[PDB]
């Protein structure tokens, strides 16, 4: 179902006009609108499971909203218009626009708790992860199964005060850290991609972002392990009376359980996997990735969009 | 509909298992087989107007064969499972696998005349083409528009005895030549893409190949011009009381006039446009180009298939 | 002399062993060490005019240090072992290792004033620059020359409190911004290279970094303009009775006036110009750019070193 | 000694003006002249060991001619201005311009015999070659040591009537053939390059070309084995009374024996390793490879040559 890439293409192109303009909500809204317009044109019967929030504080792509033209089987729809609106609003690297689709009911509930602790690797270390052990243990286990020196392991980590210990422990291990200021959907995918220069994603980030990353891991190979991370005892009580086993280790398939899973993403700014939107006299280029669990096929898709006429402008070159 | 790339992806993956094995027919047939299998699983209602040939000497993708499951409007379908299967069999560069789709009835008749004189150039210099003028004047006007000296120009020409005069005339002007043994669909698309190393395509080649190239040009921009080139007086006989004016310059739209044109190609061997199929233990990678006329969107598609 | 790439190759290979380890000084020092070791083995007679700083608080590549074995004429030498070592330490993109060489005495004084307001653009639009005009008018004139809308433009600006007004004014016009935390040598070279995603560099940054960028621009084309930006009245004091007119617009040649200018850089981490150093069992690959003013030849150099 | 790449850059740029122009001698002469002018500017003390012939039928770069500015140690110089002038003159793929430099006296004598039988592989099969065994044996041995299926082996072979048996035997093995019409210096290097799509070069080609390929193999890793291949009994007698053991198997180090070996090459037409000369409004690009035995460093060098003024033209983009 390659056509879904046009949804993240439209989101990235809409957000491209807000890159560096210091207005996170302006580019968010632009991306959301462009993506909803395109997803309703697609032959698919979606319900927004991960979106912009719930029916009020989210005017569009709210949790529960129906999407697609009506035609198609009913499925779960997850969208992150920009994974890290602040990267977009400041014009820094690695902002991406994201969607995932899976069988109806197979996506974990993103409202369970705001945060989850995470660790993710690529397929050749997919069975040695233990999110309950310290990071040094995970690093050494991944290092050995990969036959690498620990000092050549690279761990992607959100730069946050709450990660002071995790960062220290990775360094004391001797491994390296790629500090990111936002975007652990992108950081999760780079850990799982075979030869990307990051071996591991570790740390607490958003629960919706963990689920969307699980969808991509479901298609691409690898594993993420996660645990819900209540912010305080109030939120801990909520998740407990809601039925959640706060000791459960969530695996990739726990977060997205369908057998038909689809993921795609388009660069908004230049990143370690996707180039951002680039502008030219005649139009723009987008750079996307598309993948499916059923076939395991992964597609890199570079597109030249004519922002109008034919023969009016020069031809277009693609790296 | 992007899904149509899987047809050339299937054709190339099948043809790539025959690259460099010395068997034109074995690779050609595997490619036909795979593309027919896959085209009948896409949501189209198509009719082959360009393919392997007539129903008798061609069991698959024959003229008139209905392809697709098939939903959608009925439309013209044009396949070239490998544009120059000799390239594939000898392991040479620039073998591609190609299909085009357009509104039903909007493709030129591939059987009017076997051969067509062609000239094709990209968007920047399309406006200066005139296939009735001598090749020297097209070269100098294209070169001027491109801000190149004539000696910077590189003209792609099929290596054939029939092109001795054309080749002499291009050499006389001072331009460089890229002689190709086969494949003037690939050669035409290269003339129209930037930074390909080819600035112009010229000479006589297959009429079906001219039509497929025009479908691509409808999508990515540029222009091809063409004039039917009857082999003998019997074909000129056949051509004129079919109703064809052979002083008529065919433009891109005369060859493919649909408002809804689709084109895609996948590399079989490495070329100046697309990498060829690469195999490895877990799978294979294909490199494709996809384009549509109504949007003008051109897509480069690298696919890692896990077999 | 192409051989000088090995100095930045050595600086980057040393700095790459520190990428992502949280130690600014450890990577910076390893890079200094490796570049000093290697520069003294090339056939040059150079004098560091831009490096690590004064002889007291900088043992290596200090101001005045003679480098090379050394043959050849005496010349100006300028090193930046890592342009923004924070980038290296946090594993962020666009860390490069840089050197420039020019005729002796032809580089501007890096110590006149600490900071310089800059604007830099590539060859196509260099002729429209005016650093005295408002940033909005430079953007619209550059954009027109490039045949871009203003909203297609991407302006690179160091993320600093001092740039709040500049950033507001660029946002007011509608252009996009690429905010960088460090490294306006890399940012300047990116403004001047095509298809980099950056169309313009603007704002205040280090005077030594402006000079190194100008050496590069002397070689690959484009223009930088600059105006000294004294921090306090004491520096304006210092600047004026040094003899500087601070209504004076500095052009590229005012910063580096040699007829013989050399520039090279090697990637430390991945950037919009150069891939970073990649290690593997047998060895490592570096990605470099090399350029000279008298020929204008620009060289991209990928090196597979077997360790 | 990176500056030597400017010699093959000048040869390729001079030959670029003759690509497809149907005049092999015209582009040969242009390349020869441009290369000699640049090599005499280089600080080096060369004697042309492999050149355009001997002092008469070769006006320039003749066997024995001295090259370089005088400064420098004395060394052996081998130059092939275009490896396959017919590829150049017809505008077909894989024409390259080549030079090699080694310690004085360490290059085999290219006049010993016109032809030599050859087989070459990359470093991971460098010890399983036996040029005296049939090709099927070599293919299976290389296939096993590389852990590949034979049917995935690709053998580069000059398309020649004299190779009818060799071609048949490769196919009957099940391996694939990349037929080339000229240029077994380029075909040798592609066999030795690790992931180029050709695994093997086999067959009889020119003796100078085998020696130049040995120089590149000396730097890059791999091995070539060769035997002289007399064209008739007249030539067989010559090589015999000259002292040559016609049964000797020549190894890489027999063909080029120095410990300081240098090789570089520049594309003239587009090839499987180097792009050809490409022209632009402002100038041209060349694509070169440079390597040294002493360090084993291999350099890919893409250069933009301004065929004149600064700021007068557009900027330049490199894949
Ligand atoms: O910004 P917080 O509160 O630390 O939460 C982290 C989350 O924010 C993002 O960086 C951007 O929304 C996500 O990538 C990540 O999951
Ligand atoms: O081989 P012929 O008869 O000259 O016809 C040329 C045609 O053959 C092909 O090389 C493939 O059969 C086409 O690319 C080209 O149009
Ligand atoms: O960090 P400051 O004081 O604003 O100075 C900016 C300078 O710092 C650097 O980021 C590196 O120190 C340079 O690229 C830049 O010119
Ligand atoms: O052309 P011949 O006589 O078969 O000899 C082969 C030689 O010719 C070349 O193809 C070009 O001179 C060389 O690459 C090869 O060594
Ligand atoms: Mg997010
Ligand atoms: Mg990885
Ligand atoms: Mg064909
Ligand atoms: Mg700096
Ligand atoms: Mg030769
Ligand atoms: Mg190989």
Author numbering:
A (entry chain A), D (entry chain A): 0 to 318
B (entry chain B), C (entry chain B): 0 to 306
The authors write:
MtFBPaseII catalyzes the only unidirectional step in the gluconeogenesis pathway of the pathogen. MtFBPaseII comprises the only FBPase activity in Mtb and is closely related to the class II FBPase from Escherichia coli. The MtFBPaseII monomer is a compact, globular protein with two distinct α/β-type domains (I and II) arranged in an alternating multilayer fashion to form an α/β/α/β/α-fold five-layer sandwich.
In addition, we present structures of F6P-bound forms for two variants of the active-site residue Thr84: an inactive (T84A) variant (2.3 Å resolution) and a partially active (T84S) variant (2.2 Å resolution), the enzymatic properties of which have been described previously. Although the T84S mutant was co-crystallized in the presence of the substrate (FBP), only the product (F6P) was found in the active site, demonstrating that the enzyme is still active, as has previously been observed. One Mg2+ ion is found in T84S MtFBPaseII, coordinated to a glycerol molecule and to Asp79, Asp82 and Glu208 near the cleaved 1-phosphate group of the substrate. Although the serine-variant enzyme has significantly reduced activity, the hydroxyl groups of the wild-type and T84S MtFBPaseII structures superimpose at approximately the same position. The hydroxyl group of serine in the T84S variant structure is rotated compared with that of Thr90 in Ec­FBPaseII, perhaps explaining the lower enzyme activity. The T84S variant structure has the most visible residues in the structure, ten more than the apo structure. In the two variant MtFBPaseII–F6P complexes (T84A and T84S) the C-terminus is ordered (although with high B factors), with a malonate molecule from the medium found bound in the center of the tetramer at the interface of two monomers, occupying a position near the location of the AMP allosteric site in the Synechocystis enzyme. In the T84S mutant, the O7 atom of the carboxylate group of malonate is 1.1 Å (0.8 Å in the T84A mutant) from the O3′ atom of the ribose moiety of AMP. The T84S mutant also has a glycerol molecule in the active site of chain A near F6P.
